Design a protein around this ligand. Structure first.
Ligand SMILES: *[C@H](C)[C@H]1/C(=C/c2[nH]c(/C=C3N=C(/C=C4\NC(=O)C(CC)=C4C)C(C)=C\3CCC(=O)O)c(CCC(=O)O)c2C)NC(=O)[C@@H]1C
Ligand SMILES: *[C@H](C)[C@H]1/C(=C/c2[nH]c(/C=C3N=C(/C=C4\NC(=O)C(CC)=C4C)C(C)=C\3CCC(=O)O)c(CCC(=O)O)c2C)NC(=O)[C@@H]1C
Ligand SMILES: *[C@H](C)[C@H]1/C(=C/c2[nH]c(/C=C3N=C(/C=C4\NC(=O)C(CC)=C4C)C(C)=C\3CCC(=O)O)c(CCC(=O)O)c2C)NC(=O)[C@@H]1C
Ligand SMILES: *[C@H](C)[C@H]1/C(=C/c2[nH]c(/C=C3N=C(/C=C4\NC(=O)C(CC)=C4C)C(C)=C\3CCC(=O)O)c(CCC(=O)O)c2C)NC(=O)[C@@H]1C
Ligand SMILES: *[C@H](C)[C@H]1/C(=C/c2[nH]c(/C=C3N=C(/C=C4\NC(=O)C(CC)=C4C)C(C)=C\3CCC(=O)O)c(CCC(=O)O)c2C)NC(=O)[C@@H]1C
Ligand SMILES: *[C@H](C)[C@H]1/C(=C/c2[nH]c(/C=C3N=C(/C=C4\NC(=O)C(CC)=C4C)C(C)=C\3CCC(=O)O)c(CCC(=O)O)c2C)NC(=O)[C@@H]1C
Ligand SMILES: *[C@H](C)[C@H]1/C(=C/c2[nH]c(/C=C3N=C(/C=C4\NC(=O)C(CC)=C4C)C(C)=C\3CCC(=O)O)c(CCC(=O)O)c2C)NC(=O)[C@@H]1C
Ligand SMILES: CC1=C(/C=C/C(C)=C/C=C/C(C)=C/C=C/C=C(C)/C=C/C=C(C)/C=C/C2=C(C)C(=O)CCC2(C)C)C(C)(C)CCC1=O
Lengths: 296, 179, 161, 67, 42, 4, 160, 160, 161, 160, 161
């Protein structure tokens, strides 16, 4: 009288909202190694496409709140939209979020988080099941999340945790660049713009130079939200008319203009002989990653 | 085209008219009176329903097309290609319009058989617009589309069993899609 | 059938009057919503089979309706049910495109309630399946178009009582 | 076979007919079950009003034995 | 003969380059499934 | 299944 | 409108509207502003359109307003002007809907039978609509008049 | 049954059953015991037949119970087996009635549409019945198997 | 229409059950009766014309039914009455072979009572003619086979009355 | 084509092309270069559109490329990508023609019969076209993608 | 039926090829001609009745065909002859718009000779009439569009001869 699949599903239902959410994430990591792979084509995932765009468009704080709402069965339109989906779609929807979490498009689980004692045991039970039994338990773990008007409710909500240093550059120590990179990674556009002249100009990746303080100011408010850019090395020289021409490179740990979490980037700073920046050029360096390529 | 009679059963009180409409129906669908190729009549209950106004002429006409007698006369002796053109002749009054129509009825015959084909013709919008619910089908003289008039003419200028040839085996395509 | 324009025309014609300012406003409003309706119609046609698949899986499958004794038991009746839903969605899409439910009165709610009562088709289960169609569509076309599709799918539901 | 008994009033739209037409305008007829969906659609498209539908023959809920 | 359009040979290189991964052999067993209790209920 |  | 015609065409094949039909619908709703402008023009000038048309017709057809004429006398000639106003109102309906269908269904099916019963010379009715077209085309631009002409012509054509 | 089929064929010609329609009814009713035996042997080992059949199907179509397959997962494999028991139950109906009409009316009319909506590969459903015919053929004498196989094969043919 | 066999099959399918012991007992009962049914059908078939002729001769001829003002008067009415009796015997034979009266409901009685009442076909005289068919048939097929036939000819009479 | 489609619509009514139809044709010919550019884009990147979309499909539907799957093995996998190439080419025919009939007449009439005969899971074909629609959309601006998407969605909506 | 665009597409399809630069050149040539074809088509449709009237006057009237015993004699045959000329002009306008004569081979010429030869319609007289239609429409739409319409009316005439 093993009856493993329903007994395992019973154990998951007893875990608190936090443990359930943590468990499925760590289950996602095991997928392809100890757990079954996904087959999103077997779900009508076009039903969840719009909801997945809304989450991507959210801020990092809101995204994690959205997924906590799913685990807490909170009454929100996303949870209502979630509850109307089929079991396969739900599982495929969570799969997409896990794919994006790894891709950095959605905020991750708290840094260095550890799966609880009870949750890890329920995970190991799933790990020992056959493939077909795993998906069934996984399907039922998430089938009841979101909001359903009826008999539902969780004992304890699992709120997200409420939560900036100086960036080191090899061979470059110009303060103007240092304030920019730190200000950029801090999303402090109200301060970052003060490093650009009123007649300055910026050149975004795959774009023409944009000339204007207000234009460059607006661009930051639009296409640089929650964006992390790491400079690793560079070089500084004066080039012409006293302007200083610094070429600092590095990497971007955040998707940007079709870039990936592990794409290298370059900055060409062009700033006044007497201070702030007159021009700057940003160019994501192409590599086996060619998913930012258009056609004509 | 002018020297004909259209049997439109406007009432069921006149049993002589009802019987005249019925016998015209047999002549239209089977191309002549049934006596010399039946043992006893299998349509007596169908006539009873029409005469009792429980069905309409359209239902009577379809009842003739789905009968074993019709199957014996105009399905078993001929290939499905010729069944199509004899079908449209008897029930629509015309040769098949185009290759789309030949295709449409060839799939029905290939998959559902004879009764489905008759049901498709008599229940279609064309039949109702032309002959309606109360009128026995009759020979038509269509002007459009191209070749419908001469093809219908060749169908209706032959006696029953005059030969075993297809008037409209298929429309020669002008542009082969894919070839 | 009459679309939103012909409905406004008919309202003026029955009184034998020209199109006045209020009637012009209604025509203007319909014209301005045209792009949104055509957008939603394109989305529904691309996912129509999927919409009915998921609405059925959500409202009818693995229930008494599909088990022996249920009206949707047998492949014969299952397919008949799938067809009905397929026609409901398409006609609700016409009604949304036209901006007027007259096509639903004429080509859906014309003898349908009496056919269903003759065959023992459960109206309650039919209404739930349609409601599931409304939920599934809204997840595909958004909220502004999904609300409009819901208006006409609701019209069918209440038409069946 | 199962059969419906249907009443329908089908008006005239694009012509003023001069012959008697009552017989094809307001009528009651038997329709085989396998033709009703198609027939109902056709009447609806011709502008007809389906005023009454009854299962004249057969029983509701039959799984085997439809003839 | 020279390959022509529509011939699947033209896409063998693309197939080999994609090198799609087949599923692992399933280990499901009919004998160990309780049909009545396992069929979903909704 | 081979097409060669 | 072209919306109903598209749906009716789509429903005959039990199919959804194809992309081409949807594109045509999108173009139709965009041009709605121009359609409304023309209809407002005809509606605002309807009294002058009919009055001048009537004068033009009667000069061309004194017999109809002469003794024995169908429109003879003040009471009958006023009724004749009312019919011209009816058909002007129908042409306005055709304009906003972009199709002649409302004109056909309200005023052209069985129109010959009705006027023959009343003893109205149908060719004189057809002439009146020609007169209204002439006057009306003078109150709007070339494009707008060309747009409205189709509906004026349709009434004339069905009255031969 | 064979009786209803004969009656329908005769009523289509408004005539009494011919000699052959009567012979086959007489032959069928005398053979009732043998048919009831086959129906009983199939009913008794239905649990065995389906589960043995399912395992053979999976060895033939491992894809359907692997990620992306229609029957992937415990509950889906159970539903798939549930369907194999349905079509075994209908095969017993066919055997006793001597007619494939009960099979068509319950489980083969519209089956192609139903499985299209659900996404099941129907040819794999045909293979499942091909497996049940093999497993069932071993539980009965050769003659009990020849008659039973006819109704299995009708299901196989209708599901292709 | 359901014969005796399909009545059992349909009764199990609505439950989703295999043929149980009791269901097989009904099939056994019918399989045992089958020899009597077929023989009686083959006797009636060879004598159906005769059976109706004496039924009418004993029941309706030389009475006010066939005299002027009677409902069999006029050759059209006489032929219709004879035709109806031919139907009643042949369909009773169908129902007797099948072991169930459903075929009578679907293909004989559908609108029959309303038809007869609207047309003023005398029910009482019609019932006597069917009773006469019963008595003549019984004398031809033996007592027991004439008991089954009588059930279905009595069923037709109940439908009319 | 848009021209053929409107002609057959007009011939079906035994009428000359309406002003609405003639205006749609005029716009299509005058926007011709923009459509051909989209078709040129799809044509030139057909290798990458099919390969990437095919790579995504097998990730989304691993069963079809597993033992017992219709596309198992490199050779069957090649035919599946060939089929995707067929459907991409048809989408480009639809783009330049402003109508779906070239797509329908070449590769959608009888598609269900063809793929059920071959055993191919048709809904996976709908998925493969869907995958091509994303890859193609990501190679062009949003307005261009919208024009091509209509034809991708038509293919998807028909097979599915 | 095939127009100029689908002629390009079909030629590519039969070889299984996407449209290359040369194929796009052909589509561009037809797109550049679109304005000319549309304007001519609207002028012809607005003048169709008058085009045929003048074609008949100069080609058919006051001849053997209209005198008693002639094929155009009797009002029905005269009316049929005008109707046929309306058809030829209307389908030539389709062909001129499509830029392709295939519609003429399919929807006009298919079985036309057989029809006329069986009815006794004079083939030479109808060809002369169509040529008169060609002359008349050329003087209405200009030489360039007149010569384009001339191709498709001449195509019909060559089909009939
Ligand atoms: C004879 C015992 C008695 C009798 C009979 C009688 N019946 C009618 C008319 C009709 N009878 C039927 C019955 C059926 N039609 C069918 O198709 C079937 C099912 C197989 C049945 C049972 C119908 C439908 C009619 C009306 C249509 C018709 O004429 O066929 C009449 C004629 C009435 C009249 O004036 O039209 C008669 C005379 N009459 C007696 O007096 C006997 C007692
Ligand atoms: C397959 C081996 C080859 C092939 C076949 C093919 N056939 C058609 C079209 C038709 N085939 C028929 C055949 C029949 N009709 C009958 O009544 C009978 C007797 C049973 C037969 C055999 C008919 C009538 C048609 C036309 C109607 C229709 O298509 O349904 C086509 C289509 C041709 C076209 O372009 O329309 C094809 C492809 N083609 C090959 O290349 C194979 C060698
Ligand atoms: C197993 C050999 C194959 C398979 C089966 C499978 N079927 C379903 C779901 C359903 N199957 C049916 C079938 C019937 N219902 C009836 O009344 C009849 C006649 C008696 C039949 C044949 C139904 C109705 C369903 C829907 C579920 C419900 O019971 O309401 C599934 C599940 C699909 C899903 O996603 O839910 C499966 C797996 N699948 C394969 O791959 C095999 C080839
Ligand atoms: C599905 C959600 C539910 C269901 C459906 C069901 N319907 C029938 C039979 C018919 N349904 C119709 C419907 C229509 N006719 C129309 O004109 C319109 C507008 C487009 C509609 C929706 C008709 C006419 C029939 C009878 C004729 C035919 O089916 O062809 C059945 C079959 C019943 C039977 O006994 O065979 C079923 C099962 N049943 C459920 O349980 C669902 C809740
Ligand atoms: C005129 C005094 C009033 C009036 C008439 C009116 N009738 C209709 C429609 C129909 N009239 C009939 C009547 C008959 N048809 C027949 O065959 C016979 C028997 C010889 C009669 C008496 C019918 C059947 C119809 C409907 C079908 C048809 O018209 O062919 C209409 C039009 C209804 C509509 O909305 O379509 C009208 C206007 N209306 C009045 O207001 C007058 C008082
Ligand atoms: C004499 C020329 C031939 C002949 C006659 C004959 N008739 C009968 C019996 C009947 N005849 C009728 C006829 C009618 N009833 C009507 O209502 C009408 C319309 C006015 C007619 C013509 C009927 C109804 C009967 C039945 C008997 C009865 O009336 O009750 C017989 C008797 C048959 C028998 O065996 O009983 C005979 C002898 N017979 C010939 O051989 C002559 C050629
Ligand atoms: C006189 C009362 C009116 C009138 C007559 C008129 N007719 C024509 C020209 C033609 N008339 C016919 C008539 C017929 N052909 C037939 O077959 C029949 C039935 C036997 C008829 C009535 C034809 C065919 C012609 C065409 C010329 C020809 O015969 O070849 C004209 C000349 C028109 C012109 O421009 O050529 C005239 C003047 N005109 C009036 O104004 C009177 C009211
Ligand atoms: C094969 C197959 C399939 C199956 C596919 C499968 C098996 C799909 C399964 C996919 C899986 C296992 C997805 C799990 C995703 C978990 C996420 C995104 C958790 C995030 C957690 C967060 C944000 C929590 C963070 C947290 C915060 C904030 C805290 O504050 C502290 C706690 C915590 C750490 C929890 C389909 C269904 C597609 C189709 C059918 C088919 O055949």
């Amino acid at each position: 009288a093993a009856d493993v699949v329903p007994a395992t599903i019973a154990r998951f239902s007893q875990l608190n909202a936090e443990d359930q959410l943590a468990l499925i994430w760590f289950a996602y990591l095991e997928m392809g190694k100890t757990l079954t792979i996904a087959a999103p084509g077997a779900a009508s995932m076009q039903l969840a496409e719009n909801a997945l765009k809304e989450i991507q468009a959210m801020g990092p704080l809101q995204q994690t709140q959205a997924m906590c709402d799913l685990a807490n069965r909170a009454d929100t339109p996303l949870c209502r939209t979630y509850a109307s989906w089929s079991p396969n779609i739900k599982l495929g929807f969570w799969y997409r979020l896990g794919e994006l979490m790894e891709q950095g498009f959605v905020a991750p689980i708290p840094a260095g988080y550890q799966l609880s004692a009870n949750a890890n045991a329920v995970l190991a039970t799933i790990q020992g099941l056959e493939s077909g039994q795993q998906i069934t338990v996984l399907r039922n773990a998430v089938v009841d999340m979101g909001f359903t008007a009826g008999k539902d409710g969780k004992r304890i909500a699992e709120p997200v945790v409420p939560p900036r240093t100086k960036v080191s550059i090899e061979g470059v120590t110009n303060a103007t660049v240092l304030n920019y990179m730190d200000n950029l990674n801090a999303n402090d556009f109200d301060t970052l713009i003060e490093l650009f002249t009123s007649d300055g100009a910026l050149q975004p990746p795959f774009q023409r130079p944009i000339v204007g303080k207000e234009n460059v100011l607006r661009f930051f408010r639009e296409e640089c939200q929650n964006l992390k850019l790491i400079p690793e090395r560079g070089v500084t020289e004066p080039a012409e008319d006293g302007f200083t021409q610094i070429k600092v490179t590095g990497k971007v740990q955040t998707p940007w203009f079709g870039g990936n979490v592990g794409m290298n980037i370059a900055w060409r700073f062009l700033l006044n002989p007497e201070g702030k920046i007159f021009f700057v050029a940003i160019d994501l360096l192409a590599s086996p990653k060619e998913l930012l390529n258009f056609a004509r | 085209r002018q020297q004909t009679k259209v049997f439109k059963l406007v009432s069921t009180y006149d049993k002589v008219a009802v019987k005249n409409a019925i016998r015209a129906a047999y002549r239209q669908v089977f191309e002549r009176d049934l006596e010399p190729y039946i043992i006893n009549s299998e349509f007596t209950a169908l006539e009873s329903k029409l005469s009792n106004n429980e069905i309409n002429v359209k239902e009577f006409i379809e009842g003739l097309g789905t009968s074993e007698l019709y199957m014996k006369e105009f399905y078993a002796p001929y290939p499905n290609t010729k069944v199509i053109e004899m079908g449209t002749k008897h029930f629509l009054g015309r040769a098949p319009l185009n290759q789309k129509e030949i295709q449409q009825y060839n799939q029905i015959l290939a998959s559902q058989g004879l009764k489905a084909f008759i049901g498709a013709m008599v229940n279609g919008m064309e039949y109702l617009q032309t002959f309606g619910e109360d009128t026995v089908p009759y020979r038509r003289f269509p002007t459009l589309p191209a070749a419908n008039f001469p093809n219908t003419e060749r169908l209706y200028n032959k006696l029953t069993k005059q030969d075993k040839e297809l008037v409209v085996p298929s429309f020669t395509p002008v542009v082969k899609v894919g070839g | 059938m009459q679309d939103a324009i012909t409905a406004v025309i008919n309202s003026a014609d029955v009184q034998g009057k020209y199109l006045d300012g209020a009637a012009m406003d209604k025509l203007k409003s319909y014209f301005a919503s045209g792009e949104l309706r055509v957008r939603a119609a394109s989305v529904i046609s691309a996912n129509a089979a999927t919409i009915v698949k998921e609405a059925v899986a959500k409202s009818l499958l693995y229930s008494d309706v599909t088990r022996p004794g249920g009206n949707m038991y047998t492949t014969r009746r299952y397919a008949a049910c799938i067809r009905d839903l397929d026609y409901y969605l398409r006609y609700a899409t016409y009604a949304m495109l036209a901006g007027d439910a007259s096509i639903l009165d004429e080509r859906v709610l014309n003898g349908l309630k009496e056919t269903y009562n003759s065959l023992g088709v459960p109206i309650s289960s039919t209404v739930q399946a349609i409601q599931a169609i409304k939920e599934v569509t809204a997840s595909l076309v958004g909220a502004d178009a999904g609300k409009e599709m819901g208006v006409y799918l609701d019209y069918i539901c209440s038409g069946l009582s | 076979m199962r059969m419906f008994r249907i009443t329908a009033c089908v008006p005239s739209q694009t012509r003023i007919r001069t012959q008697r037409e009552l017989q094809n305008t307001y009528f009651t007829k038997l329709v085989p079950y396998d033709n009703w969906f198609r027939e109902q659609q056709r009447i609806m498209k011709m502008g007809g009003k389906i005023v009454k539908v009854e299962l004249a023959t057969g029983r509701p809920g039959t799984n085997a034995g439809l003839a | 003969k020279k390959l022509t359009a529509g011939n699947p040979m033209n896409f063998l290189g693309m197939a080999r380059s994609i090198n799609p991964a087949a599923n692992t052999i399933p280990k499901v067993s009919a004998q160990n499934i309780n049909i009545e209790a396992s069929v979903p209920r909704r | 299944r081979r097409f060669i | 409108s072209i919306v109903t015609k598209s749906i009716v065409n789509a429903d005959a094949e039990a199919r959804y509207l194809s992309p081409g039909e949807l594109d045509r619908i999108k173009a139709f709703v965009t041009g709605g502003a121009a359609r409304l402008r023309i209809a407002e023009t005809l509606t605002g000038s309807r009294e002058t359109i009919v009055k001048q048309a009537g004068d033009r017709l009667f000069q061309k057809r004194p017999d109809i307003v002469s003794p024995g004429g169908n429109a003879y006398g003040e009471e009958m000639t006023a009724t004749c002007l009312r019919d011209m106003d009816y058909y002007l109102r129908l042409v306005t309906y055709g304009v906003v809907s972009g199709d002649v269908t409302p004109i056909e269904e309200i005023g052209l099916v069985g129109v010959r039978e009705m006027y023959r019963s009343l003893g109205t010379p149908i060719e004189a009715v057809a002439q009146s609509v020609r007169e209204m077209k002439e006057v009306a085309s003078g109150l709007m631009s070339s494009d707008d008049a060309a747009e409205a002409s189709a509906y004026f012509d349709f009434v004339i054509g069905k009255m031969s």
